[PDB]
């Protein structure tokens, strides 16, 4: 696959021949265990020495890349002839795509790039799946044809909201975007909590949905313990009528004794320990770094002469060190239990604008990493 | 409660203040603990830096340590809006060699010297770090 | 006329209408644009984007301004970036220099389907061949959009667009230069898709909905046919340091006329006026010795003596080279060693114990207790009731003390240094030199803080009569002779003169390189010099060297030319003779016809376009009647003390920083006013710390530039400058938005509809390390302060006699046309400057032959020394107006079109020796080069590989020097010791070795060692040496010696001298 010309007709010790390859071929000029880079110029002049050829000159077909998804989007490629020069490949559009165009073949070319596609796989967003307790607000979003990248507005019911919403600003409508793969942004009108019942009557309650919106909580036994969550988030009423199983460091001090409804202070004997309520599937040494367990302040007696924060249920775990907010990242406090050390482990939130682990040998992308989801890196 | 003999390193030979000799101790102690320790075991306070050659020789001495910080004698004594740094031995503060955005980023009330670069960083006084003293 | 759009950064942008069909295979974008200084970082002037879908985006081509270093934002250049639909990567090509923030630039990006090229001012500055094929298919032609001045992500642009032009074919460079020369309509050609005049911006362009349309103004882009700005060299500082300006002073003897210079000697007296600092005998003897020394160099000195009777100022000790902050520093300083100093507060005295014990204070002051470690006897010695203040107080924190700095002395005296060379006297304990002499290019050279500080103990002494000549040479712009060897940063400094030249070292061709020594002869071996072991023809007898005063007796004529040129340049107020400054450059031939020729010349060397009036603002006026002034009064609030309002003496005059992206002492900072002991407060959140810069003459402004020198590298927020509020004389504050800034180029703001006069600005900052170097206000075209002044006139005199009427008329403008030329005759022209009735020195003469060629004719004539010839007379291209080619440009055609060859893709035979990037390392025809393999190093780590030495060197890597930490990007190209840092290597001495093996053992004619770092620490002035030992096959070491490392010698060549026996 080349044109060769020798300036001397006679072949003798000292003659040279210039070989230049044709279009669509890449040179690989090599020697014995010597892999040199390809010459930019087409012409290479080879001279025989001692009756032998000093180098090997070859011209491979120019390797077009295996047809990527970034070449033609939403297509599957079948190339039986390969990816060499002169080869052809076919592409078939996806199931959520329409094949429009005269020819659906891509040709590998001289320069090493696949030719311009003559068929455009056009993706059309269909009707989105329904969401419970939500109504679609846009009339053109009910159709089966929609532009890709636009937003369709779904409004939740009053009392249903996106979780993480503030009390003062309760937003009851969201939007979902038609994505590139024909799907939509996921969104569920699920509220985390209507309102929390007081701890003095916790334990015997049975609700339809737990603490969720419009959940009727009843306590099995004047008035009764039956209340209904309202639109503003409040109830129409309220509930009415020695712990030897302690932890390794747990201490309880009662200012009013063991009377009904009295509140006693809880503490851990170790200075670097905090008392929390651990779930049954959450151990002591495998608490997740994204989880924020509920810290214990007081033990308050209930109507069944028991303790809402039971002392055995109370675990004194290794508490947060006081080294928070000192422009220093620590591996112990790098969790939501210790506010990710006050956000010092992320560049965008630290005050000195540079992440510095306190030990000089810590995993910067590992244990001493930035795990704050409010940071600009995440 | 005095430190060991193997961990103490004697540094002397600075072109400025060749009479004053420093001791770097790799005993990881806090500011108050190491301050009172080298007050009660030696006859001087923590190191007060007054020029650049002392800072450069101290950085050369502590650049081999695995810990990133060493202790110097700086301490912030004041409240309000305009506080004042001062050394532990009562000498005046005339030399300041800080890092980027260091004295106006809050943080700890004590002053430490970084082993990489030699610039000073505000650090918490309860951190167990190596300390430099002199007598 | 010609109209130009003004895009601002607020979001003003356009898009092309869909009727014009965008090019697919080849295109050419030509646009005259005038950028502003402060830009958004990837600013887009013109882009071809796709709005079809958000998959495989940034396809198309975009021209704009973007920084080379993305993580630092230091070097902003014009770029052209292309990514065709068939390609998998985007290729960006950039210009060769930072963009000029106030000048018209003719950008032209062409692409012919295989090569993408960028032309800046008609000279090709970048090319690439990665992108191939057409840009997009005809099927996808509907969704392609052409945005002007912006993008989808609001990458806006601040500046002027004059002549937009889009072509469906890729023009050659000659057609680019033709369209630059001919700015007319190209719509007659069918290939021209779109050329633009902004008479009707609503015809072919539609603005965005949110972003309003940019305003159309009048431009006058092609205002000048001669570029009147001549840049100094890299080692120079002013227009006088230029080679072509100093060549006229060196050649012509009419420039070195005798000049009378007025200087003032100030002696401090008490109130009784009995005790002089200097006696009248040594004053007269120094004046006689000075007039004896400078009579043969045509400089006349007029002595004035001023008697200052202040009893408090006389009792103090004036410290020349000492600092009041160095007194408390425990490092001993030689210059601060006197009785009134206290021997640096005892720090240079060995009786001072190293411990700090604060003794009890009781009664009278003690001499042993007055030291720093005794805390100045508890302040008893500085009390005025105990003893005298002027002999006992050593505490620099006290308001009244024994010693005083000269910079504090000049503030007390406040001597008008604009008319006399003030001489000051101060004591130096080291006594090896005098005080600090202010250079002519410093901002204080005409202020009250400038002059010469001398030592009165050696004043007019038979062995010390030549120090005032040395300091006067320093104050007239002469460096030391040993500047090119001893007063350099490292061995890689560009000003290290290997050979005598006008652009290196002391900027003198006569003075040979030499180190510093006290001998009156040639020195022998020296370790201070990098590569030069010996020197010959050392100027030991020169006044500027370090020889003794009896040895120094001669001035070179080049130093005389520099002194006369700096007296003409900046020192016009000192001389009582009001003769105007000459036109320092010869007149240039712009063009010739069959019956006429046209001449245009530079402005005079004074830089003033108006007559000299003492009591007005005539020195601020430019070529037009605009007024360009700097911040006369600065005021910033003291952060700790409430309503402190400290006045920065820096950040007032003309900008005077050397490294433009480095923290400096010549700049205002928000945290520089506070003491070291107090905690510097952070700036407030809604506004920030502000600088209030007041200008001397309030006027109607049109432009405002701020030289923001240093910005914070780790800067998460968007804009460093929070806002800029112009203070009007009526009391109204006119607020501008948050302005983006760059490190290198000055921030420039164009002000619209500011009818009221503005006397100052306030610059607000949320950054505490921001440094402002200067501010500059430029007024409108007609200023009432410049209407009173009368401009200079110019008279053209020919060596053949001209006509009486032609010679009689004095030209206001700098253009001359004559029709009185014969076709075969030779004419020498010159121009004399006439202010009133008095005339100046003649300009150098231009010899012109009416038949033969010249500099700007367009034909290369090698007889006149023309390496290139283009008709531009513009220094922005590759060919100068002196018709010599510029640095790293090559001009090919007979009408010289020039291209940037230093970073080009191709390698040519004339750049094999010079360039390591385009070609390989240069090996001669009788030699072969073999590179290392399987090398072993002394120190190995995980971060440093150690096997990166195998094979070809890192030719694309640049050589770094004075670098603190080598952890940026050099670990992937070259090996340095990872485990040992420079302070730890300084503490414990160790030796590193690099053992490199070779596959085929051959003879070693030379050893090529390619380095990317000199090894010089930024705090240590010592040079670094490498020792090379050849190892045999019999395992024997042959020493090749110690060699210094320089970035100039990147492939160090070590020649092996083998004995032939």
* Among candidate residues A126, A122, A123, A106, the one with its CA nearest the CA of residue A114: A106
The tokens describing C153, both together, are 């992500």
Cβ separation A328–B100 shorter than 8 A? no
* Among candidate residues C625, C901, C661, C633, the one with its CA nearest the CA of residue C782: C625
The tokens describing A95, both together, are 């199931």
Q: How far is CA C794 from CA C598, C607, C842, C863, C951, in A?
A: 15, 14, 11, 31, 65
Give dist(CA C435, CA C459) in Å, integer. 13
The shortest C-alpha distance from C1051 to chain A (Å) reads 22
The shortest C-alpha distance from C1006 to chain B (Å) reads 38
Q: How far is CA C764 from CA A166, C141, C674, in A?
A: 35, 47, 18
Torsion of CA C386, C391, C392, C397, to 10 degrees: 110
Q: Please report residues of A whose CB lies closer than 8 A to that of C134.
A: 116
Is C87 in CB contact (< 8 Å) with chain A? yes
Q: To which H or E segment does residue A99 belong?
A: strand A98-101
Give dist(CA A193, CA A191) in Å, integer. 6
Cβ separation A325–B106 shorter than 8 A? yes
**Are A277 and A213 within 8 A, CB to CB?**
no
The shortest C-alpha distance from A297 to chain B (Å) reads 27
Give me Rg for the CA atoms of chain B: 14
> Which residues 6+ apart lie within 8 Å of C668 measured at CB?
C634, C636, C648, C650, C651, C691, C771, C772, C773
Q: Please report residues of A whose CB lies closer than 8 A to that of B102.
A: 352
Give dist(CA C976, CA C983) in Å, integer. 15
Is A351 in CB contact (< 8 Å) with chain B? yes
Q: Please report residues of A whose CB lies closer than 8 A to that of C85.
A: 116
Helices marked H in C720-815: 804-808
Of B51, B60, B94, the CB nearest to C986: B60
The residue with tokens 């090509």 is C93
Cβ separation A115–C134 shorter than 8 A? no
Angle at C823 between CA C822 and CA C829, to 5 degrees: 60
Cβ separation B85–C677 shorter than 8 A? yes
Give dist(CA C454, CA C451) in Å, integer. 10
> Which residues 6+ apart lie within 8 Å of C508 measured at CB?
C481, C500, C502, C556, C558, C559, C562
Give dist(CA C520, CA C514) in Å, integer. 12
Cβ separation A328–B68 shorter than 8 A? no
**Are B89 and B48 within 8 A, CB to CB?**
yes
Give dist(CA C783, CA C95) in Å, integer. 38
Task: Supply the DSSP string of C312-323, one letter for each residue.
Answer: HHHHSEEESS--
Q: How far is CA A209 from CA A131, A214, C899, in A?
A: 18, 8, 77
**Are C439 and C507 within 8 A, CB to CB?**
no
- The torsion angles phi and psi of A329, rounded to 5 degrees, stand at -95, 130
Give dist(CA A231, CA A228) in Å, integer. 10
Q: How far is CA A193 from CA A159, A165, A293, C558, C585, in A?
A: 10, 10, 17, 88, 85
**Are C1 and C210 within 8 A, CB to CB?**
no
Give dist(CA C1055, CA A138) in Å, integer. 83
- Please tell me the experimental approach by which this structure was elucidated: cryo-EM
- Show which subunits contact A, needing at least 3 CB pairs below 8 angstroms: B, C
The residue with tokens 């129409």 is A236
CA–chain centroid gap for C646, Å, is 29
Burial class of C66 by CB neighbour count within 10 A (0 to 12, 13 to 18, 19+): buried
**Are A353 and B108 within 8 A, CB to CB?**
no
Count of residues in chain B: 135
Cβ separation B68–A359 shorter than 8 A? yes
The tokens describing C1059, both together, are 């004995």
Query: Which residue out of B105, B110, B115, B125 would a mutagenesis test of the A interface target, given it has the greatest number of A Cβ atoms within 10 Å?
Result: B105
- The torsion angles phi and psi of C7, rounded to 5 degrees, stand at -85, 135
Number of Cβ within 10 Å of residue A128's Cβ equals: 18
Burial class of A308 by CB neighbour count within 10 A (0 to 12, 13 to 18, 19+): middle
Of B53, B63, B83, the CB nearest to C983: B63
Query: Given the DSSP bridges, would you call strands A217-219 and A105-107 parallel, antiparallel or unpaired?
Result: unpaired
Give dist(CA A376, CA A347) in Å, integer. 9
Q: How far is CA C976 from CA A360, C168, C942, C1012, in A?
A: 21, 52, 12, 10
The tokens describing B69, both together, are 């910080």
* Among candidate residues C57, C50, C17, C58, the one with its CA nearest the CA of residue C141: C50
The residue with tokens 């020594």 is C517
**Are A246 and A259 within 8 A, CB to CB?**
no
Give dist(CA C235, CA C381) in Å, integer. 49
> Which residues 6+ apart lie within 8 Å of C151 measured at CB?
C13, C44, C47, C49, C62
Q: Is C183 annotated as a binding residue?
A: no
Give dist(CA C207, CA C43) in Å, integer. 18
CA–chain centroid gap for C570, Å, is 18
Give me Rg for the CA atoms of chain A: 36
Helices marked H in C252-352: 280-293, 311-315, 342-345
The tokens describing C384, both together, are 């005025």
Q: Is C470 annotated as a binding residue?
A: yes
Count of residues in chain A: 378
The tokens describing A328, both together, are 């220093």
Of A65, A114, A118, the CB nearest to C139: A118
**Are B85 and B73 within 8 A, CB to CB?**
no
Q: C376: left (phi > 0), else alpha (psi -120 to 50), else beta?
A: left
Q: Which residues pair with C110 in a beta bridge?
A: C28, C117
CA–chain centroid gap for C648, Å, is 22
Angle of helix C467-475 relative to helix C280-293, nearest 10 degrees? Answer: 60
Of B48, B63, B93, the CB nearest to C984: B63
Number of Cβ within 10 Å of residue C527's Cβ equals: 9
Q: Please report residues of C whose CB lies closer than 8 A to that of B60.
A: 983-984, 986-987
Is A35 in CB contact (< 8 Å) with chain B? no
CA–chain centroid gap for C393, Å, is 43
Q: Which residues pair with A49 in a beta bridge?
A: A52
Could you give the strand order of the β-sheet that contains A2-6, starting from the edge strand earlier in sequence?
A2-6, A16-21, A43-49, A52-53
Query: Given the DSSP bridges, would you call strands C826-834 and C846-849 parallel, antiparallel or unpaired?
Result: antiparallel
Of B82, B101, B118, the CB nearest to C679: B82
**Are C365 and C375 within 8 A, CB to CB?**
no
Cβ separation B85–C714 shorter than 8 A? no
- What's the distance, Cα to Cα, between the start and end of chain B in Å? 18
Number of Cβ within 10 Å of residue C404's Cβ equals: 19
Give dist(CA C343, CA C403) in Å, integer. 12
Helices marked H in C221-279: 243-251
A interface toward C at CB cutoff 8 Å? Answer: 65, 68, 70, 73, 101, 109, 111-118, 120, 148-149, 180, 347-348, 353-354
Angle of helix C243-251 relative to helix C557-569, nearest 10 degrees? Answer: 110
Give dist(CA A77, CA A67) in Å, integer. 7
> Which residues 6+ apart lie within 8 Å of B57 measured at CB?
B11, B13, B14
Query: Which residue out of B18, B55, B60, B100 would a mutagenesis test of the C interface target, given it has the greatest number of C Cβ atoms within 10 Å?
Result: B60
CA–chain centroid gap for B52, Å, is 14
* Among candidate residues C684, C851, C678, C708, the one with its CA nearest the CA of residue C773: C708
Cβ separation A360–B127 shorter than 8 A? no
Q: Which residues of C are catalytic?
A: 471
Give dist(CA B63, CA B66) in Å, integer. 8
Give dist(CA C629, CA B107) in Å, integer. 44
Task: Supply the DSSP string of C536-551, one letter for each residue.
Answer: SS--TTBTTSSS-TTT
Give dist(CA C258, CA C300) in Å, integer. 7
The shortest C-alpha distance from C130 to chain A (Å) reads 10
Give dist(CA C703, CA C34) in Å, integer. 14
**Chain A residue with Cα closest to B116:** A360
* Among candidate residues C291, C306, C265, C261, the one with its CA nearest the CA of residue C422: C265
Cβ separation C86–A180 shorter than 8 A? no
Q: To which H or E segment does residue C995 belong?
A: strand C994-997
Count of residues in chain C: 1061
Is B122 in CB contact (< 8 Å) with chain A? yes
Q: Is C474 annotated as a binding residue?
A: yes
**Are C596 and C817 within 8 A, CB to CB?**
yes
Of C54, C139, C715, the CB nearest to A120: C139
Query: Given the DSSP bridges, would you call strands C793-798 and C826-834 parallel, antiparallel or unpaired?
Result: antiparallel
* Among candidate residues A356, A354, A364, A327, the one with its CA nearest the CA of residue A342: A327
Burial class of C511 by CB neighbour count within 10 A (0 to 12, 13 to 18, 19+): buried
Q: Please report residues of C whose CB lies closer than 8 A to that of A348.
A: 716
Q: Please report residues of B whose CB lies closer than 8 A to that of C681.
A: 81-82, 104
**Are A25 and A85 within 8 A, CB to CB?**
yes
Query: Which residue out of B9, B65, B76, B92 would a mutagenesis test of the C interface target, given it has the greatest number of C Cβ atoms within 10 Å?
Result: B92
* Among candidate residues C980, C959, C979, C981, the one with its CA nearest the CA of residue C970: C959
Q: Please report residues of B whose CB lies closer than 8 A to that of A342.
A: none
Cβ separation B51–C332 shorter than 8 A? no
Burial class of C1055 by CB neighbour count within 10 A (0 to 12, 13 to 18, 19+): exposed
The residue with tokens 């023809």 is C537
**Chain B residue with Cα closest to C684:** B104
Q: How far is CA C657 from CA A67, C442, C579, in A?
A: 55, 10, 33
The shortest C-alpha distance from B99 to chain C (Å) reads 11
For residue A60, give the 3-state DSSP assignment.
Answer: strand
> Which residues 6+ apart lie within 8 Å of C829 measured at CB?
C587, C599, C796, C797, C798, C799, C816, C845, C846, C848
The shortest C-alpha distance from A242 to chain C (Å) reads 55
For residue C984, give the 3-state DSSP assignment.
Answer: helix
The tokens describing C445, both together, are 């050279």
> Which residues 6+ apart lie within 8 Å of C849 measured at CB?
C826
Cβ separation A73–C53 shorter than 8 A? yes
Give dist(CA A233, CA A242) in Å, integer. 37
Angle at C400 between CA C398 and CA C405, to 5 degrees: 95
Q: Which residues pair with C265 in a beta bridge?
A: C305, C423
Give me Rg for the CA atoms of chain C: 33
Most distant CA pair in chain B: distance in Å? 44
**Chain B residue with Cα closest to A359:** B67
- Show which subunits contact B, needing at least 3 CB pairs below 8 angstroms: A, C
Of B67, B105, B124, the CB nearest to A360: B67
Of B91, B95, B101, the CB nearest to C356: B91
**Are C156 and C181 within 8 A, CB to CB?**
no
The shortest C-alpha distance from B19 to chain A (Å) reads 33
CA–chain centroid gap for A316, Å, is 32
Helices (H) and strands (E) in chain B, counts: 2, 7
* Among candidate residues C183, C155, C182, C199, the one with its CA nearest the CA of residue C46: C155
Task: Supply the DSSP string of A187-252, one letter for each residue.
Answer: -----S-S-PPPGGG-SSEEESSTTSTT--EEE-----S-B-B-SSS-BSS----------SSEEE
Angle at C162 between CA C161 and CA C168, to 5 degrees: 90
**Are B9 and B61 within 8 A, CB to CB?**
yes
Give dist(CA A197, CA A192) in Å, integer. 14
């Amino acid at each position: 696959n080349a044109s060769l010309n020798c300036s001397s007709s006679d072949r003798y010790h000292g003659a040279q021949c210039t070989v230049s390859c044709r279009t669509g071929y890449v040179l690989q000029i090599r020697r014995d265990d010597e892999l040199i880079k390809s010459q930019t110029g087409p012409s290479v002049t080879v001279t025989c020495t001692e009756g032998k050829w000093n180098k090997q000159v070859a011209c491979e077909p120019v390797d077009c890349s295996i047809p990527d998804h970034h070449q033609v989007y939403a297509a599957s490629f079948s190339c039986p002839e390969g990816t060499t020069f002169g080869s052809q490949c076919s592409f078939q559009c996806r199931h959520p795509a329409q094949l429009k165009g005269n020819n659906s073949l891509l040709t590998c070319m001289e320069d090493g790039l696949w030719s311009f596609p003559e068929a455009l796989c056009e993706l059309m967003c269909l009707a989105p799946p329904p969401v419970p307790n939500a109504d679609l607000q846009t009339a053109r979003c009910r159709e089966n044809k929609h532009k890709v990248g636009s937003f369709c507005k779904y409004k939740c019911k009053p009392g249903y909201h996106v979780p993480g919403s503030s009390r003062k600003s309760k937003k009851r409508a969201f939007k979902t975007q038609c994505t590139q793969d024909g799907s939509w942004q996921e969104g569920a009108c699920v509220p985390v909590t209507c309102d929390p019942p007081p701890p003095k009557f916790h334990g015997l309650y049975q609700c339809t949905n737990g603490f969720q919106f419009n959940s009727e909580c009843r306590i099995k036994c004047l008035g009764s313990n039956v209340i209904h969550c309202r639109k503003d988030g409040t109830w129409n009423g309220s509930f009415h009528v020695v712990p030897n199983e302690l932890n390794s460091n747990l201490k309880l001090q009662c200012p009013d004794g063991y009377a009904i409804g009295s509140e006693c202070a809880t503490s851990c004997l170790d200075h670097n320990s905090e008392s929390i309520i651990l779930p049954m599937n959450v151990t002591v040494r495998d608490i997740p770094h994204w989880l924020n367990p509920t810290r214990v302040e007081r033990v308050v007696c209930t109507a069944g002469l028991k303790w809402y924060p039971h002392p055995a249920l109370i675990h004194c775990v290794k508490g947060c060190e006081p080294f928070m907010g000192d422009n220093y990242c620590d591996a112990i406090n790098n969790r939501a239990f210790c506010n990710y050390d006050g956000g010092d482990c992320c560049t965008s939130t630290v005050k000195t604008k540079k992440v510095t682990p306190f030990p000089m040998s810590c995993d910067l992308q590992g244990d001493c990493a930035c795990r704050d989801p409010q940071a600009q890196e995440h | 409660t005095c430190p060991e003999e193997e961990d103490t390193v004697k540094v002397v030979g600075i072109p400025g203040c060749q009479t004053c000799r420093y001791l770097l101790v790799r005993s990881l102690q806090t500011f108050s603990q190491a301050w009172f320790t080298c007050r009660r075991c030696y006859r001087g306070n923590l190191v007060s830096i007054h020029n650049f050659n002392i800072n450069y020789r101290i950085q050369c001495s502590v650049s081999a340590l695995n810990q990133g910080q060493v202790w110097i004698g700086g301490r912030i004594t004041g409240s309000g809006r305009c506080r004042r740094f001062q050394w532990v031995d009562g000498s005046r503060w005339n030399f300041a060699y800080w890092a980027a955005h260091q004295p106006w980023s809050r943080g700890g009330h004590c002053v430490a010297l970084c082993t990489r670069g030699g610039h000073w960083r505000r650090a918490h006084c309860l951190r167990r770090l190596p300390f430099i003293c002199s007598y | 006329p010609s109209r130009a759009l003004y895009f601002s950064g607020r979001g003003e942008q356009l898009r092309l209408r869909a009727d014009l069909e965008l090019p697919r295979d080849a295109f050419t974008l030509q646009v005259w644009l005038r950028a502003e200084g402060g830009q958004r970082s990837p600013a887009v002037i013109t882009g071809l984007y796709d709005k079809c879908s958000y998959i495989s985006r940034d396809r198309g081509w975009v021209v704009g301004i973007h920084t080379i270093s993305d993580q630092d934002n230091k070097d902003p250049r014009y770029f052209f970036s292309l990514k065709t639909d068939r390609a998998r990567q985007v290729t960006t090509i950039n210009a060769h220099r930072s963009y000029l923030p106030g000048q018209w630039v003719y950008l032209a990006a062409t692409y012919d389907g295989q090569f993408m090229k960028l032309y800046v001012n008609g000279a090709q500055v970048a090319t690439s061949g990665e992108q191939v094929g057409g840009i997009f298919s005809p099927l996808t032609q509907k969704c392609k959009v052409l945005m002007l001045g912006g993008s989808a992500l609001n990458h806006n642009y601040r500046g002027y667009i004059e002549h937009f032009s889009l072509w469906k074919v890729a023009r050659t460079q000659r057609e680019i230069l033709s369209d630059m020369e001919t700015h007319g309509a190209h719509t007659a050609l069918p290939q021209l898709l779109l050329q633009e005049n902004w008479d009707n911006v609503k015809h072919a362009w539609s603005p965005m909905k949110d972003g309003s349309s940019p305003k159309v103004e009048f431009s006058n882009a092609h205002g000048f046919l001669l570029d009147t700005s001549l840049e100094p060299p890299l080692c120079g500082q002013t227009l006088c340091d230029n080679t072509e300006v100093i060549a006229s002073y060196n050649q012509l003897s009419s420039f070195r006329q005798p000049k009378v210079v007025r200087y003032r000697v100030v002696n401090l007296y008490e109130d009784d006026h009995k005790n002089p600092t200097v006696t009248r005998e040594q004053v007269d003897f120094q004046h006689h010795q000075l007039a004896e020394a400078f009579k043969q160099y045509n400089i006349s000195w007029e002595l004035d003596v001023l008697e200052v009777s202040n009893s408090s100022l006389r009792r103090r000790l004036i410290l020349a080279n000492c600092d009041i902050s160095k007194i408390g520093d425990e490092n001993c300083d030689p210059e601060c060693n006197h009785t009134l100093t206290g021997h640096d507060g005892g720090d240079c005295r060995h009786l001072r114990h190293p411990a700090f014990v604060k003794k009890q204070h009781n009664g009278v002051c003690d001499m042993d207790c007055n030291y720093e470690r005794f805390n100045f006897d508890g302040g008893e010695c500085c009390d005025p009731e105990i003893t005298n203040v002027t002999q006992t107080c050593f505490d620099p924190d006290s308001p009244h003390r024994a010693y005083l700095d000269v910079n504090e002395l000049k503030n007390i005296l406040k001597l008008d240094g604009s008319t006399h060379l003030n001489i000051f006297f101060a004591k130096s304990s080291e006594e090896e030199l005098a005080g600090v002499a202010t250079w002519p290019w410093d901002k204080e050279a005409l202020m009250h803080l400038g002059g010469i500080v001398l030592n009165p103990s050696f004043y007019g002494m038979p062995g010390h009569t030549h120090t005032m000549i040395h300091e006067i040479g320093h104050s007239l712009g002469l460096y030391h002779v040993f500047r090119g060897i001893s007063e350099i940063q490292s061995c890689s400094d560009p000003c290290m003169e290997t050979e005598p030249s006008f652009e290196t070292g002391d900027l003198c061709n006569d003075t040979n390189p030499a180190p510093k020594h006290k001998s009156c002869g040639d020195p022998g071996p020296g370790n201070d010099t990098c590569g030069f072991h010996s020197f010959f023809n050392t100027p030991y007898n020169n006044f500027m060297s370090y020889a003794d005063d009896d040895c120094t007796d001669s001035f070179t004529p080049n130093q005389v030319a520099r002194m006369h040129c700096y007296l003409d340049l900046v020192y016009q107020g000192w001389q009582p003779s009001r003769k105007p400054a000459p036109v320092a450059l010869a007149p240039q031939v712009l063009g010739h016809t069959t019956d006429s020729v046209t001449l245009e010349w530079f402005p005079p060397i004074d830089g003033h376009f108006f007559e000299r009036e003492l009591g007005s603002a005539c020195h601020l006026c430019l070529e037009g009647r605009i007024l360009v002034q700097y911040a006369s009064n600065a005021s910033s609030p003291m952060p700790c003390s409430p309503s402190g309002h400290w006045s920065p003496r820096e950040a007032e005059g003309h900008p005077d920083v050397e490294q433009p992206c480095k923290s400096s002492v010549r700049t205002w900072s928000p945290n520089s006013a506070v003491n070291p002991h107090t905690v510097p407060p952070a700036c407030p959140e809604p506004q920030g710390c502000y600088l209030e810069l007041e200008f001397l003459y309030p006027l109607v402004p049109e432009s405002l530039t701020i030289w923001v020198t240093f910005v914070s590298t780790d800067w998460d927020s968007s804009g460093a400058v929070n806002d800029i509020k112009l203070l009007a004389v009526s009391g109204k504050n006119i607020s501008l938005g948050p302005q983006n800034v760059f490190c290198d180029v000055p921030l420039t703001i164009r002000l619209w509809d500011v009818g009221e006069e503005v006397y100052g600005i306030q610059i607000y900052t949320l950054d505490e390390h921001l440094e402002i170097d200067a501010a500059m206000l430029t007024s409108t075209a007609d200023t009432p302060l410049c209407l009173q002044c009368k401009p200079l006139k110019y008279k053209v005199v020919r060596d053949p006699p001209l006509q009486m009427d032609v010679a009689s008329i004095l030209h206001l403008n700098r253009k001359f046309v004559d029709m009185d030329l014969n076709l075969g005759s030779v004419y020498q022209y010159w121009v004399i400057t006439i202010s009133g009735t008095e005339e100046s020195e003649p300009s150098p003469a231009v010899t012109y032959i009416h038949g033969s060629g010249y500099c700007g004719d367009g034909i290369i004539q090698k007889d006149q020394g023309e390496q290139c010839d283009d008709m531009n007379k513009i220094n922005g291209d590759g060919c100068s107006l002196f018709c010599r080619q510029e640095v790293s440009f090559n001009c090919i055609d007979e009408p010289s079109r020039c291209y940037f060859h230093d970073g080009d893709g191709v390698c040519e035979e004339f750049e094999q020796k010079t360039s390591i990037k385009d070609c390989g390392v240069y090996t001669p025809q009788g030699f072969l080069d073999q590179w290392a393999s399987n090398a072993s190093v002394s120190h190995q780590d995980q971060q440093c590989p150690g096997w990166v030495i195998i094979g070809q060197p890192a030719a694309s890597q640049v050589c770094r020097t004075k670098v603190i930490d080598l952890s940026e990007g050099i670990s992937q190209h070259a090996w340095y010791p990872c485990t040992i840092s420079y302070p730890y290597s300084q503490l414990a001495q160790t030796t590193f070795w690099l053992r490199a093996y070779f596959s085929q053992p051959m003879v070693a004619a030379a050893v090529i060692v390619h380095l990317v770092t000199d090894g010089t620490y930024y705090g240590d002035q010592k040079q670094e040496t490498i020792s090379v030992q050849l190892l045999d096959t019999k395992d024997q070491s042959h020493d090749l010696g110690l060699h210094v490392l320089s970035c100039r010698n990147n492939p160090l060549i070590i020649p092996v001298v083998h004995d032939l026996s």
